[PDB]
């Protein structure tokens, strides 16, 4: 066994003989229970595409909270346990709030990701609070270093990506992103591209029935994180449907 | 002027103490019939003299504190100790926005150091000596004790000295003869002496 499900997770003050505590490995499993969130980076912004799992059609906007607004240039698309999803949103956001007051300028993503990553690992250390167990992405367009996309997993590892997907179909999705181009092209061409990857990856042993939500954070929306318009969403989706078939 | 009149004459063992009742606010005597002489115990009596607020507030607190010490040791608080103890208390309190300064007299008989009577100044200067007064009266009361006795003459003649000092209280300062609270404090406890 590379993990024990009772023994060495009785407290969050543990380590394990390999070097990594089992609670963190379980926290990657928590993200597997939910659907996929993809986010592909341009040089004019980031575009997210998350599939949102639905049980009813009485759902309206601000339901499930797959897209959060961390700042007025920082966007977040999430995947995994929605419960956990709210605290990670707070952690990134509070860091952003102090930053904005004091520094007085747009946040460079290179600093935010490491800074947040410290905090995500910091819950894991403590046994005052349990590790996190949702995974998120930060995608930003700024003049501070351009468009940049990071992914921070519940362990507290931060890495650069032009294309990251976190889910239960993250491995299958990431390979799929690498075959397509989106690296140098505008957010307007890209939106169409984020949608199709979600449909092609979309399996019936890793995901369930979904309504598409996509999001901007780039030059078209003038920095700020907004959800794509319904009209635009439906053209990006219309390509996504065609591309599967 | 410092504060209204007090006259205190230590005998040589006994100490006979008097303060006016007249606790006056605005231009009337509010109280005119109560002792602001406090029984902190039976073996020790403390008599606090000063302003209206600092007298009642500092001593009532001290009293409850005296009792607590008694339980702990299971012997009466030591007299020598009480003399230094009152000096630390009045210096600490003195900075407070509501002003605390006491012209105090500790009288106790202890089975330790012995008898103590304490002269204590308005500059929070502790001294044992025999003959004390309260107010700008401290100068007026200490002075008649230096000449007329060697401060070892009977309590009865001391009372006659006190009557003469009280006549000054009518002349130099404002207080009327009407009421003074008089107590003699010895080893047994306090004895109520006649009002003037």
């Amino acid at each position: 066994m590379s993990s024990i499900g009772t023994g060495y997770d009785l407290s969050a003050s543990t380590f394990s003989p390999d070097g990594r505590v089992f609670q963190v490995e379980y926290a990657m499993k928590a993200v597997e229970n939910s659907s996929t969130a993809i986010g592909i980076r341009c040089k004019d912004g980031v575009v997210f595409g998350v599939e949102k799992l639905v049980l009813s059609k009485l759902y309206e906007e601000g339901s499930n909270k797959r897209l959060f607004n961390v700042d007025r240039h920082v966007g977040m698309a999430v995947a995994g346990l929605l419960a956990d999803a709210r605290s990670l949103a707070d952690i990134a956001r509070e860091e952003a709030s102090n930053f904005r007051s004091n520094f007085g300028y747009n946040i460079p993503l290179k600093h935010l990701a490491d800074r947040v990553a410290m905090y995500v690992h910091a819950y894991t250390l403590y046994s005052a609070v349990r590790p996190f167990g949702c995974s998120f992405m930060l995608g930003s367009y700024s003049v501070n270093d351009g468009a940049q996309l990071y992914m921070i997993d519940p362990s507290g590892v931060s890495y650069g990506y032009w294309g990251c997907a976190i889910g239960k179909a993250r491995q299958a999705a990431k390979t799929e992103i690498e075959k397509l181009q989106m690296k140098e092209m505008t957010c307007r061409d890209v939106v169409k591209e984020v949608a199709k990857i979600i449909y092609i990856v979309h399996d019936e042993v890793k995901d369930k029935a979904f309504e598409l939500e996509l999001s901007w954070v780039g030059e078209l929306t003038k920095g700020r994180h907004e959800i794509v318009p319904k009209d635009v969403r439906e053209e990006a989706e219309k390509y996504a449907k065609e591309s599967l078939k | 002027m410092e504060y209204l009149i007090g006259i205190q004459g230590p005998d040589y063992v006994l100490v006979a103490s008097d303060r006016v009742a007249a606790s006056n606010i605005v231009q009337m005597k509010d109280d005119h019939d109560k002792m602001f002489k406090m029984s902190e115990k039976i073996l020790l009596l403390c008599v606090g003299e000063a302003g209206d607020t600092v007298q009642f507030a500092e001593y009532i607190q001290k009293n409850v504190q005296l009792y607590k010490m008694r339980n702990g040791y299971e012997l009466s608080p030591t007299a020598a100790a009480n003399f230094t103890r009152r000096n630390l208390a009045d210096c600490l309190r003195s900075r407070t926005p509501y002003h605390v300064n006491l012209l105090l007299a500790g009288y106790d008989e202890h089975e330790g150091p012995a008898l103590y009577y304490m002269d204590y100044l308005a500059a929070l200067a502790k001294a044992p000596f025999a003959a004390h007064g309260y107010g700008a009266f401290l100068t007026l009361s200490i002075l008649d004790r230096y000449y007329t006795p060697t401060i070892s003459r009977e309590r009865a003649v001391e009372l006659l000295r006190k009557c003469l000092e009280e006549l000054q209280k009518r002349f130099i300062l404002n207080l009327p003869t009407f009421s003074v609270r008089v107590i003699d404090k010895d080893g047994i406890h306090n004895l109520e002496n006649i009002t003037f």
């Binding site: 601000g62 956001r93 904005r100 003038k222 700020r224 | -």
Partner: protein, 216 residues
């Protein structure tokens, strides 16, 4: 009743509210006492994609407020996907801050005018140095409130809201009058309009001159 001796002042912030837009003119000049150090100066800021803020009086007290309103706005938009903040909560919470700082007797006044729509309603709010919030037909704060606002009031008195053309003639009339009557300022104005996309208002440019009463 108060007014601290201001060092770095923006003298005037003009404001008239219309049907879905607001037209604001904001003084280009930044007087630092008598010397006019900087003209280029736009005092209207972009908080978010459907809000704007324009203030007159001390500019320092303004720069402290713009970041603070930035962190309050950043907390509120997180909750939605594109939710934007209404004018009234941010302006009223800031009102309570200025009422407290007024009581502290060494302080400097600023008076701001917020335009937002975050409700089902377009809100025009003010936080003042004295503090209060109200609606207004046409507004001006600080030095505008003292002298042009009364000219505006005169107009407002039989005709509740003016037309577009008439507001332009007044603007033109107004800049003359401020340079002539108040000191620190200049004629130079920036025209700033806020709409549902953000605030747009390019750099302050010179406009009509007349410090002549030789002709009068």
């Amino acid at each position: 009743t108060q007014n601290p001796m201001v060092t770095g002042t923006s003298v005037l912030g003009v404001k008239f509210d219309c049907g879905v837009v607001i037209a604001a003119d904001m003084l280009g000049s930044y007087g630092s006492l008598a010397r006019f150090r900087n003209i280029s100066r736009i005092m209207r800021v972009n908080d978010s994609t459907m809000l704007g803020a324009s203030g007159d009086y001390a500019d320092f007290q303004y720069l402290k407020q713009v970041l603070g309103q930035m962190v309050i706005d950043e907390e509120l938009f997180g909750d939605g996907h594109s939710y934007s903040p209404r004018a009234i909560h941010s302006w009223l919470t800031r009102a309570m801050y200025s009422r407290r700082s007024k009581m502290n007797p060494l302080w400097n006044t600023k008076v701001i005018g917020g335009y937002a729509g975050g409700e089902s309603f377009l809100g025009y709010v003010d936080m003042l140095g004295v503090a209060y919030e109200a609606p207004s037909l046409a507004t001006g704060y600080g030095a505008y409130l003292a002298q042009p606002l009364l000219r505006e009031v005169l107009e407002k008195q039989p005709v509740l809201s003016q037309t577009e053309a008439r507001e332009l003639v007044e603007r033109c009339m107004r800049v003359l009058y401020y340079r002539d009557a108040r000191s620190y300022n200049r004629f130079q104005v920036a025209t700033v309009t806020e709409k549902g996309v953000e605030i747009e208002g390019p750099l302050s440019a010179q406009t009509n001159w007349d410090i002549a009463h030789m002709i009068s």
